[PDB]
Enzyme design. Sequence first.
Site, PDB file in Angstrom:
ATOM      1  N   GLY A 198     -51.875   6.859  39.794  1.00 49.95           N
ATOM      2  CA  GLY A 198     -52.219   7.481  38.523  1.00 49.95           C
ATOM      3  C   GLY A 198     -51.398   8.713  38.162  1.00 49.95           C
ATOM      4  O   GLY A 198     -50.647   9.253  38.981  1.00 49.95           O
ATOM      5  N   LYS A 199     -52.988  10.600  35.998  1.00 48.63           N
ATOM      6  CA  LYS A 199     -54.399  10.903  36.263  1.00 48.63           C
ATOM      7  C   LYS A 199     -54.950  10.071  37.409  1.00 48.63           C
ATOM      8  O   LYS A 199     -54.250   9.769  38.382  1.00 48.63           O
ATOM      9  CB  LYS A 199     -55.240  10.704  34.991  1.00 48.63           C
ATOM     10  N   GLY A 200     -56.238   9.700  37.292  1.00 50.31           N
ATOM     11  CA  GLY A 200     -56.958   8.944  38.332  1.00 50.31           C
ATOM     12  C   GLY A 200     -57.303   9.927  39.438  1.00 50.31           C
ATOM     13  O   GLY A 200     -57.022   9.704  40.622  1.00 50.31           O
ATOM     14  N   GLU A 302     -42.820  26.122  44.551  1.00 48.95           N
ATOM     15  CA  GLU A 302     -44.087  26.794  44.358  1.00 48.95           C
ATOM     16  C   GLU A 302     -44.929  26.701  45.638  1.00 48.95           C
ATOM     17  O   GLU A 302     -45.080  25.612  46.213  1.00 48.95           O
ATOM     18  CB  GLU A 302     -44.835  26.151  43.186  1.00 48.95           C
ATOM     19  N   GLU A 315     -45.271  22.506  45.187  1.00 49.47           N
ATOM     20  CA  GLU A 315     -44.362  21.603  44.508  1.00 49.47           C
ATOM     21  C   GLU A 315     -43.023  22.259  44.196  1.00 49.47           C
ATOM     22  O   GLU A 315     -42.876  23.481  44.258  1.00 49.47           O
ATOM     23  CB  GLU A 315     -44.992  21.093  43.206  1.00 49.47           C
ATOM     24  N   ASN A 317     -40.799  22.689  41.019  1.00 50.01           N
ATOM     25  CA  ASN A 317     -40.627  22.554  39.581  1.00 50.01           C
ATOM     26  C   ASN A 317     -39.135  22.445  39.307  1.00 50.01           C
ATOM     27  O   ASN A 317     -38.389  23.394  39.547  1.00 50.01           O
ATOM     28  CB  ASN A 317     -41.182  23.774  38.844  1.00 50.01           C
ATOM     29  N   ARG A 319     -36.915  22.660  36.996  1.00 51.91           N
ATOM     30  CA  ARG A 319     -36.475  23.194  35.724  1.00 51.91           C
ATOM     31  C   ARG A 319     -36.519  24.728  35.736  1.00 51.91           C
ATOM     32  O   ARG A 319     -37.207  25.349  36.552  1.00 51.91           O
ATOM     33  CB  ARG A 319     -37.382  22.647  34.628  1.00 51.91           C
TER      34      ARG A 319
END
Length: 460
Positions: A198, A199-200, A302, A315, A317, A319
């Site tokens: 998924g 959301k989910g 992060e 994570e 990021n 960008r």
Amino acid sequence: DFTVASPAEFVTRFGGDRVIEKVLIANNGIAAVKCMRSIRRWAYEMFRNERAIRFVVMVTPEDLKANAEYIKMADHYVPVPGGPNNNNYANVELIVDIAKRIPVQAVWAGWGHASENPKLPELLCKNGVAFLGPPSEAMWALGDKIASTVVAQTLQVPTLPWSGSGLTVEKGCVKDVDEGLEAAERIGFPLMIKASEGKGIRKAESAEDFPILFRQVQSEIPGSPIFLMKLAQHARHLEVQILADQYGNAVSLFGRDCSIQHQKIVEEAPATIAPLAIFEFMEQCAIRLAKTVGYVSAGTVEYLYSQDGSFHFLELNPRLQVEHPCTEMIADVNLPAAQLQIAMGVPLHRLKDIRLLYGESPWGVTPISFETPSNPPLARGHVIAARITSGTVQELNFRSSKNVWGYFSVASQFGHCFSWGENREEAISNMVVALKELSIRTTVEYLINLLETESFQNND
Ligand SMILES: CO[C@H]1CCCC[C@@H](c2ccccc2)OC(=O)[C@@H](C)[C@@]2(O)O[C@H]([C@@H](C)[C@H](O)[C@H]2OC)[C@@H](C)/C=C/[C@H]1OC
């Protein structure tokens, strides 16, 4: 005072392999304005010609009608469809078409819109256009939580307790409500239940909630593997800024701390909250993580930093972020210019700001040890950035502080103020003086109160 005549000559003489002299910005507002201003300042210094690198921008009907500043600021503009951004700035296919037709030799997406869509660099490269960002393969790897986490673990980068803990590369998922309760018991609550397809997703605050919410996820995406991940209770968010070239080098540019939050309301650089020796490991972990996924350009690793002193990978990021000027200030690195240079194939040790940050000579050609340096560069002073609230851009110049700057933009107005000082205290104090000017009012009163509390001035 090293200058050259053209981008063609810059590429040759600085060890690059691709001439970029026209760029398409797939963005608007402060992103578009910041990109052009940073790169043109660099073109001025390098070419004695602020327009040596030409800019094309995308413009929606709404931005045209508002007469958004970045339209006239650009060398050329292209009208694009209106409505939700999947019709414009986040439309990969539209962006590539325009890029190909002009033609430009590179695209800059900044943050927001398609800046995290791997399909963008993918389709651009396929059509011979460069991207001021990571390549698709890097984005695909960091793109999903599980693979990302497993990559981190194998590299000795600590990860939060989750159902796939211990897994390594060279069954982190649960099947039943009953297998899940077992895994959940080892992990602890609060925890995340996520189907990996998924959301989910659901947050289970206790084990009594676990069955219903787990079953909900199974109903939502039937058959998909489910994983469980601990939620850090009241952790700080810390970010390491990294810059990576096309030759396997990455360098960290200290980091940023989110010392007030669900939007980031106040951010600081450097992140002083953590002992320098452990932040330095956080930095080295980001570099290695960047290197092994083949990261290129600017990115952020992060981390969650808890009060006890543990940090955990969250994570990457893929960008540049809107708060990047904090980092730019304490590091004296022009980040958009660095991205452009890196997309031209210039290696990190030929980036003049990188050499100066490292105490080397600006135009030297010698390589630099970036991963665990012996005498690591020192952050220059301290920056506080505050989010102010309630593609047109209005800059704020403060007659009360020469070291504070900000802006507010309309899509109610959001924006950021940036305050530098020689130390954390000078920085907080300059910010307060400017916010008080700003109230020539409700969000500044909010921020001034916050910055004046003992808790914040002592940072804990
Ligand atoms: C949209 O343009 C604004 C953006 C201002 C952002 C806040 C400000 C700041 C940060 C922290 C504290 C106080 C102020 O950042 C800065 O001035 C510095 C770090 C920086 O961004 O300046 C730009 C570049 C040289 C480069 O990118 C970087 O320098 C290495 C120049 C082109 C200034 C542009 C401004 O327009 C006049």
